[PDB]
Write a protein that binds this ligand. Sequence first.
Ligand SMILES: OC[C@H]1O[C@@H](O[C@@H]2[C@@H](CO)O[C@](O)(CO)[C@H]2O)[C@@H](O)[C@@H](O)[C@@H]1O
Length: 416
Amino acid sequence: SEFAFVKIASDGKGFTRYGEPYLIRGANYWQGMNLGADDCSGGDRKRMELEIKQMAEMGINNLRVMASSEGPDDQPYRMRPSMMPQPGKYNEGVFVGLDYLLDTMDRYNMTAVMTLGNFWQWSGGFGQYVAWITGNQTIPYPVGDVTYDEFTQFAARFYNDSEIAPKANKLFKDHIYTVQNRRNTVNGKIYKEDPVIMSWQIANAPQEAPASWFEEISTFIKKGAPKHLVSAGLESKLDEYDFDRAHDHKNIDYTTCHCWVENWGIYDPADPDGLPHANEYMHDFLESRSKWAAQLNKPIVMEEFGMARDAWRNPEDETYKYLPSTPTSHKDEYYQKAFNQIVSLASNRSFSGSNFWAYGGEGRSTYPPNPYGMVWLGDPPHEPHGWYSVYSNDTTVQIIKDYNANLLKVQKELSK
Ligand SMILES: OC[C@H]1O[C@@H](O[C@@H]2[C@@H](CO)O[C@](O)(CO)[C@H]2O)[C@@H](O)[C@@H](O)[C@@H]1O
């Protein structure tokens, strides 16, 4: 019986599970694995269990999590301790964190999108694999005078450099194999047989990877886990051509987009008048990506989006922007409008849900780092702590809760 496995509907316009439509009432929780680790490897398991419980009470049925991270552990801007400090060598204390993450998600009947790698630097990612291959541990982190474009050209050698790509992909493939074949030490399930996992996701946000790379990798992931969906992890921030290069492949089962107004220069959170322009952008983003998904006849999930706190209330004070006590009136309206639009599109089966970025839970940006230097919450350590996290008692919690109720209501209407 594969009844419990999330599937694509035979008409391609949404997901199914248990013989019924399945809508994604999601959140991002990439920190789950590290919080699930035992106290010795810097975890806080009781807090992870409470965070999952908090999320179940807000109606969340789906977490996108990180199922990779690379050392070596002396690197800035990344998760510590790492899951894979050197190629093929695993921090078992961190890996057991993933086991518990998946076991707790099961008890709350959530599904997981298992992200297998990262283009960005905060879990090591593609840039780290490249560093292992060239033997050169000086990654050009985009801090100070180094730009994102320069870091991107370095990391993109993972799949564009005809000498580096085959060796890098060999290491990445060994990691994919190890994760798909992990026996969960808590409940005994082998990951590739676990219906709790909705999909394997190639990577977070690959930047202009060639078509033949998505073709190859997705095929390999699917042969590795034939019961599961496979996903690309693309932002879809460019155009339809870019979207097709990632998604038009027999083993990419559904499509995704990521919407970042501040990061793309669309939205300035210090500007008291900037919200309407971000709302409109979110608005055309959802309508146009929706059309691109429909042209491939595959489902679409907005698997990342977010907004900063109300920095415009005190524009000239940088620290104010990240304080938990700072309100989120813009973020709240932005989330609410996007959610209302998704609910309306999902009613005509032209969108399948979303995962906000990202749940902070009980973490706060004012807390001290743990002994490995981590202030765990929704913002990875390449970014200011507290930028986008949604905290357990934020006003945005009610908005997300209502959205998850509306989206479940729609899934029920469609199940008739
Ligand atoms: O910044 C929030 C969240 O965004 C994702 O990555 C962003 C992408 C979005 O376009 O662009 C960057 O800002 C680099 O320019 C990158 O950090 C998300 O996947 C995660 O990495 C990040 O926390």
